[PDB]
């Protein structure tokens, strides 16, 4: 019955992927950002310049106030509001209704995005990182406890304005090609994984693999960019600069500030390298790699002039909180969040990204010794 959930995601580039949901009785429809990088379900519940609608608790007969406050500080953006519960459904999801915790957002700061077309956020990670604390049961845990829905979901996020699928409760085999490759979830708080090797155009970065996971590596659909720890970011940018040194770009470009443009259809894709991230596998001394194309980490943005150029921003940026495999890594891959078996699967997506002479890939098996030493303690 997964076909009903195919193409249930929409979004704008750089502004996330959202799914339609209803809260309350009678049901109020809202678009909700799908975020595997957090664990709170929260919706606008008061007027805001960027909101065209919001949750009106007084209009819902099933709303229950929990008489407790809450706030969540993200890397960028934060909101505060009031905790309560209400009935929640996903129209293009499983045919069930659950009573879930809901943070009613009363104040926010750089949380809502102008024109994003979503009014709330669905944190799909584990209770350990829920606010105020891990006693606030996350939505997916409620879903699994109250229904027969299997304890897993999969995300197919597609690039070019964008669409995708969140398959709740399973894997839809029409959404990917080739084999699924699984990496262990290291610990159930974020979807934390372990990167064991990095190559750029087939050249090993040659860092202590702990640097790749300092202080963690997570899979985060709520984040746009691939974000890399400072030392790894620097090495990666140096390598990518060298490979593309045929052309020169302003430093603002490499900092993700300035966009670069070329005449429509003349984008020099080949001067930008492929990036391979090797992830810890399921058996001893075994790993696999996912390979990212420049079409993924050069994010398409709207033309700043009145011309018909192709313009892009560099969608790899520096992090001080570990590696973040955001939407530009997930795009073109089918990613299975197999909570039941504490593992995350990757396969080439049916909406895989195109290049004339190169292709995004998930490949294995590889042998990698001492993968345990790659985890940061
Ligand atoms: C403008 C760029 O955003 C586009 C971005 O919009 C947002 C997305 C998020 C979710 C965040 C994005 S992040 O970059 O802050 C990383 C984080 N996950 C790791 C993390 C870091 C710090 C703290 C926590 C908690 C929640 C566990 C405490 C979790 C995610 O959840 C919060 C926001 F406000 C905005 N607007 C989107 F549109 F979704 F692409």
DSSP string, 158-199: ----EEEEEEETS--GGGEEEEEEEEE-SSBTTBB--EEEEE
Q: Is the CB of 75 under 6 A from ligand 1?
A: yes
The C-alpha atoms of residue 156 and residue 166 are separated, in whole angstroms, by 6
Q: Nearest residue CA, atom 10 of ligand 1?
A: 222
CB 282 within 8 A of CB 205: no
Q: Is the CB of 223 under 6 A from ligand 1?
A: yes
Distance from residue 102's CA to the centre of ligand 1 (Å): 18
Deposited experimental method: X-ray
Mutate to test the pocket of ligand 1, among 76, 123, 256, 319 (most ligand atoms within 8 A of CB): 76
Nearest to 179 by CA among 369, 46, 33, 365: 365
Distances (CA, A) of 201 to 55, 78, 244, 360: 48, 38, 11, 12
Nearest to 162 by CA among 296, 15, 12: 12
Distances (CA, A) of 204 to 67, 208, 239, 298, 347: 54, 11, 10, 21, 23
Nearest to 316 by CA among 230, 250, 246: 230
Distance from residue 166's CA to the centre of ligand 1 (Å): 19
The C-alpha atoms of residue 63 and residue 324 are separated, in whole angstroms, by 35
* Rg of the chain (C-alpha set): 21
CB 374 within 8 A of CB 209: yes
First to last CA, the chain: 42
Catalytic residues: 35, 220
Burial class (CB in 10 A: 0-12, 13-18, 19+), 269: middle
Mutate to test the pocket of ligand 1, among 31, 77, 221, 328 (most ligand atoms within 8 A of CB): 77
Q: Nearest residue CA, atom 39 of ligand 1?
A: 16
Strand partners, 39: none
Nearest to 279 by CA among 244, 325, 227, 232: 325
Query: Residue-wise over 276-303: b if at least 16 C-beta within 10 A, else e?
Result: bbbbbbbeeeebbbbbbbbbbbbbbbee
Structural domains in the chain plus CATH codes: 17-149 (2.40.70.10), 150-377 (2.40.70.10)
CB 292 within 8 A of CB 360: yes
CB 146 within 8 A of CB 114: no
Resolution of this model in Å is 2.1
Residues 6 or more apart from 146 whose CB is under 8 A from it? 96, 98, 99
Tokens of 103: 């943070």
The C-alpha atoms of residue 50 and residue 120 are separated, in whole angstroms, by 12
Q: Is the CB of 16 under 6 A from ligand 1?
A: yes
- The DSSP secondary-structure symbol of 244 reads T
């Amino acid at each position: 019955s997964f076909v009903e959930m195919v193409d249930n995601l929409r979004g704008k580039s750089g502004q996330g992927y959202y799914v339609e949901m209803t809260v309350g009785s009678p049901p109020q429809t809202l678009n909700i950002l799908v975020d595997t990088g957090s664990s709170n379900f929260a919706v606008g519940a008061a007027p805001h310049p960027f909101l065209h609608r919001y949750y009106q608790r007084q209009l819902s007969s099933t709303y229950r106030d929990l008489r407790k406050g809450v706030y969540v500080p993200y890397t960028q953006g934060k909101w505060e509001g009031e905790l309560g519960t209400d009935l929640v459904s996903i129209p293009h999801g499983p045919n069930v209704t659950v009573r879930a915790n809901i943070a009613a957002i009363t104040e926010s700061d750089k949380f809502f995005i102008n024109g994003s077309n979503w009014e709330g956020i669905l944190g799909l990670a584990y209770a350990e990182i829920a606010r105020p604390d891990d006693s606030l049961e996350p939505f997916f845990d409620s879903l699994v406890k109250q229904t027969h829905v299997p304890n897993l979901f999969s995300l197919q996020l597609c690039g070019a304005s964008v669409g995708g699928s969140m398959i709740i409760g399973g894997i839809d085999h029409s959404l990917y090609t080739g084999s699924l490759w699984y990496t262990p979830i290291r610990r159930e708080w974020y979807y934390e994984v372990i990167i064991v090797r990095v190559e750029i155009n087939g050249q090993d970065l040659k860092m202590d693999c702990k640097e790749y996971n300092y202080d963690k590596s997570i899979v985060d659909s709520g984040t746009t960019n691939l974000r890399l720890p400072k030392k790894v970011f620097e090495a990666a940018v140096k390598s990518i600069k060298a490979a593309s040194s045929t052309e020169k770009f302003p430093d603002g470009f490499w900092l993700g500030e300035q966009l670069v443009c070329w005449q429509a259809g003349t984008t020099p894709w080949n001067i930008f390298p492929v990036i391979s991230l090797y992830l810890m596998g399921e058996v001893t001394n075994q790993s696999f790699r996912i390979t990212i194309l420049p079409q993924q980490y050069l994010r398409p943005v709207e033309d700043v002039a009145t011309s018909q150029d192709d313009c892009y921003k560099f969608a790899i940026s520096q992090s001080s909180t570990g590696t973040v495999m955001g939407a530009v890594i997930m795009e073109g891959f089918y990613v299975v969040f197999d909570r039941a078996r504490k593992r995350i699967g990757f396969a080439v997506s049916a909406c895989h990204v195109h290049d004339e002479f190169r292709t995004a890939a998930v490949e294995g098996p590889f042998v990698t010794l001492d993968m345990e030493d790659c985890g940061y303690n």
